[PDB]
Symmetry: D2
Subunit: 294 residues, 4 copies
């Protein structure tokens, strides 16, 4: 087999290490870890070599992009050139790009029939009351975003809280913002990791006592999870819908049923690997092996 | 005929006025001018009405997006919902979005065989000298960008100037940056306006005495233009390649031949209309008439 | 008399016009309106001439700074050099600088015994409940700030609203934030204009029906005002405390008495002049005449 | 003795550790390390207790501020309240604030007779050529700043390089910018640390081969230094001029003589302590002991 695999990321942390690791072990591939910001290239004379620290990169059979949530325009541009050069990517540029846009993504999932929590979109709404009644929620979650980031979620328990929050962010200096209703659940969401056509690993993220969130560490506490065949199907469908080869789908257990809340094109590996003991980084190299062409 | 056409833009300026104007005249259409930021809607239960100042919008047969270069994530999200609701757009969401990304666009044009000036892409290159020799240029233009904007172009006449400039912007607080070679020309570029499958109008933009630029007004001076059949074909091909129904293509007259430098999905109307005396806003309403379905 | 007065501001709008106007009329002074951003100078060899569009400025007997709320670091640097060159300023650099910092200013006023509304300061408080009980308010105003700007005020009517708002902004991407209690009043505040040791003019700013604010135009409606001798004294004391020669003091009429809410070192002239019919721009030139040394 | 000393900083890193360390050792003081962002307090009813994680802070005899270069408005506001409460600060709020403003500081040093390199100040100069000839330098250093930060320095060796750089940053999206001439020296500057009325420690910072800088690590390499009595006097005078109790003065060895280039109100301790083996953190606690009042 023996591939030259590149890993597009900004440094050596567990996930990037765990595949330098699993690609050198598994069918003895060669691996170079490249900062996308240090690539530079002629986007003109179509294709052309990619340059890195004064030398020309040597042609990778595959590229594993792991692009930051703040470097996504240049990151995917570099990714694109590798694709143009022949490298197989897990998660392709177009799909990664789209994925960062939570709005376009939520829309896409919704159109494709995937059960989400009822969700409003807004920026400078002009009539907060009408916005709150739309969506329905007497208590709901407001999620600030700003461009393509996320900079806060907050629970609004009463009508007035939801009003004061929206009116606050309305001062466009916060820009785009999302409304969806809160849950039964209990600060607990299931995170599935999809690689290709299967859910490779899954954990429960539980919130702390003080309010909810649940986030990785906003007071988070991980534990191994018991996914229903229904939840497994959905998390795969979300990834398929998104055109992601590797993805983190987050699911909320509502009375009505499982609801997708978020999809990630660069899920972290540490918490989910350490929690379950599963070789995820290996299932990704294995996926590359089944699809890249040497 | 009689359509309800919406115009997605942030205010009443010549271009937005000139089509409220041309749609009310031409086959007596009804027009509402909407700020995208004031739309708010359920992106979930697939489709769902768009809300605006407390009321529900009434279904537009067509939407004319004219989205700002700084509102492009929410703008195209709102655009998308109109599309999902049945409205025909001139310039669709996906195509508009992509267009803002100058990097993805330059790449796309290049791949599709369109003659551009030789162009390097870079962010934090690590070896400026190698970057400068790549691209070739002893004198070249450095174009700062930052995310998806543009915040400066500058001519670097010597090797050292090109060095000092790159090293300056390299401090990532400027982020993504473009290198391409300077011209014969003479601070003068041809701007074509494409509507559908034809170039509807064209002007020459001439720079002032002090250095170049040429920009609309960075010292700009407009005058009617004599486009060659070759230049006309290209400006149409660029728009086709970009999937833009309406576009501003800017062309540089180089010795080698015409070179596309830029493509815009919301070209201004004033300078080009006043200069030529052509009813552009009408050719766009006319285009809508040939393609929207009532 | 005949002075050379410079006006440090970024353009010709009512206030800047109304003193080019009043300085050319009143004792026939000469006036140049300079953009601070276009000044450039040697801050070293102590003093040294200030340069502007390739020429050296000619020595102004006085400088009227009218520096933007976003240009205040360079603005006051240029201001400083004029001071170093001999020019008398109304509002000096140090005082202007300090004034932009609403936190340092509120603190200073408070220390100097000036009645303010009870006010909490916070950034990432860690225990919102304790913050809300401090300050007291069951209903209070949260005022987002971010560095030195202001980007929103909002009323929180219930405990929960005040909670959700603080928790929202707590995501430091909003940075520094202010809590103070809401009023009787009724979206109405008195704005005094101080020039030297007297209140030169005063208006009432009344809010619209929908909630409060009251702002110039956040639904604002101006009308001539009846200031009590007590309110007049305070607005003068605030300016004195702040070391401002010209200032806009905003006062809230509370049961307890008049409360300073805000102090401005570049108050607008239009609304207050048109409302009252008073020649404010002239009272400022007159002040310059009494204090600048030719 | 036994003082309660607070350390205002955002975390445990060498310098903050090395004084928790030296204050618990030296005359057995009690130390609490507080994040300024987590303080919250009533700036009104003059003074009032400072709150931290739901509890009231207990009165510190002294406060050691170590405020970030990006938190300086809120940081110094919290600092100010400690001062208002009786705590002795090394480096007081006003002096710290001013210090962040490199422009006001360079100006102040210059006015007070301290030899600096010849330095131009500019933002959007309008005539770069005149700016370059002012300052004199055929080769000079351009230092981007933006508000109050620093985001780049660069050497411009030729006239054209200096032109292209200024014209680049001129696009105000870089904001305020500094010109000063380059050196003999050789990417090497002397860094003195002043505590009170003496230079407590000093190192040489040497640049790498590729161009200059010299920065801590922009390729930096530290080594113990041999300060002349002249250089020692200056570094003390700079700190005195700046009203800093603790300061990092950086000096360039020019033919003409020693030139101050920079003054810091929160110098790092690690590089300078490890290089020289001097107990700096102790000389600061000792200073506090001589001046704080229990
Ligand atoms: N609609 C909702 N209902 C209930 N809890 C939610 C909802 N949205 C988010 N949360 C909680 O808040 C946390 C933050 O959500 P968010 O930032 O959108 O996603 P992520 O967990 O991927 O960062 C989630 O882990 C979840 O437990
Ligand atoms: N590669 C180039 N060679 C010569 N001149 C150029 C080049 N790129 C840009 N210019 C000049 O600088 C101006 C600014 O270009 P740019 O900002 O990229 O496009 P736009 O004109 O669409 O804003 C152009 O009008 C053009 O005349
Ligand atoms: N503590 C308060 N109590 C009642 N109303 C307030 C309070 N603070 C502000 N407001 C109202 O909100 C408006 C916005 O206040 P702010 O932005 O702080 O000052 P400014 O009016 O100078 O912009 C004010 O005009 C005022 O009428
Ligand atoms: N005027 C100058 N002449 C020569 N070298 C300089 C000059 N200014 C700065 N340098 C070099 O560049 C480095 C960066 O300078 P700067 O960022 O201003 O200060 P600091 O070293 O405090 O960060 C300095 O250490 C110095 O060696
Ligand atoms: N969200 C869109 C798709 C977005 C895209 O294709 O990029 C939809 O409803 O299909
Ligand atoms: N620039 C890409 C296309 C980008 C896209 O499809 O969005 C190419 O070379 O085809
Ligand atoms: N706010 C400070 C004064 C601020 C200053 O002097 O700059 C005080 O209580 O005196
Ligand atoms: N730079 C000023 C002093 C600045 C200040 O006092 O804050 C001077 O020349 O004195």
């Amino acid at each position: 087999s023996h591939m030259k695999i590149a890993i597009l990321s900004r440094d050596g942390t567990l996930y990037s290490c765990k595949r330098l690791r699993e690609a050198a072990i598994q069918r003895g591939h060669l691996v170079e870890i490249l900062d996308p910001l240090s690539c530079y290239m002629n986007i003109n004379p179509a294709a052309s070599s990619i340059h890195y620290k004064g030398r020309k990169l040597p042609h990778f059979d595959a590229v594993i992009p792991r692009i930051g949530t703040a470097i996504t325009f240049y990151g995917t541009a570099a990714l694109r050139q590798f694709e143009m050069l022949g490298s197989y990517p897990l998660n392709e540029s177009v799909a990664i790009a789209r994925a960062r846009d939570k709005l376009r993504s939520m829309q896409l999932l919704a159109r494709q029939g995937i059960d989400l929590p009822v969700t409003g979109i807004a920026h400078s709404p002009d009539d907060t009351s009408d916005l709150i009644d739309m969506v329905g929620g007497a208590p709901l979650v407001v999620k600030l975003v700003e461009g393509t980031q996320g900079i806060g979620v907050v629970l609004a328990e009463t009508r007035q809280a939801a009003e004061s929050v929206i009116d606050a962010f309305r001062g466009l200096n916060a820009h785009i913002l999302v409304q969806e209703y809160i849950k039964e659940a209990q600060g607990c969401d299931i995170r599935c990791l999809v690689v290709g056509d299967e859910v490779v690993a899954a954990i429960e993220r539980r919130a702390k006592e003080g309010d909810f969130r649940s986030n990785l560490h906003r007071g988070g506490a991980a534990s191994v999870a018991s996914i229903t065949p229904q939840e497994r199907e959905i998390a795969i469908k979300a990834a398929r819908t998104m055109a992601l080869d590797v993805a983190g789908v987050d699911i909320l257990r509502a009375n009505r049923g499982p609801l997708v809340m978020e999809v990630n094109a660069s899920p972290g590996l540490e918490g989910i690997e350490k929690t379950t003991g599963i070789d995820i980084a290996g299932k990704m190299i294995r996926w590359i092996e089944r699809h890249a062409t040497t």
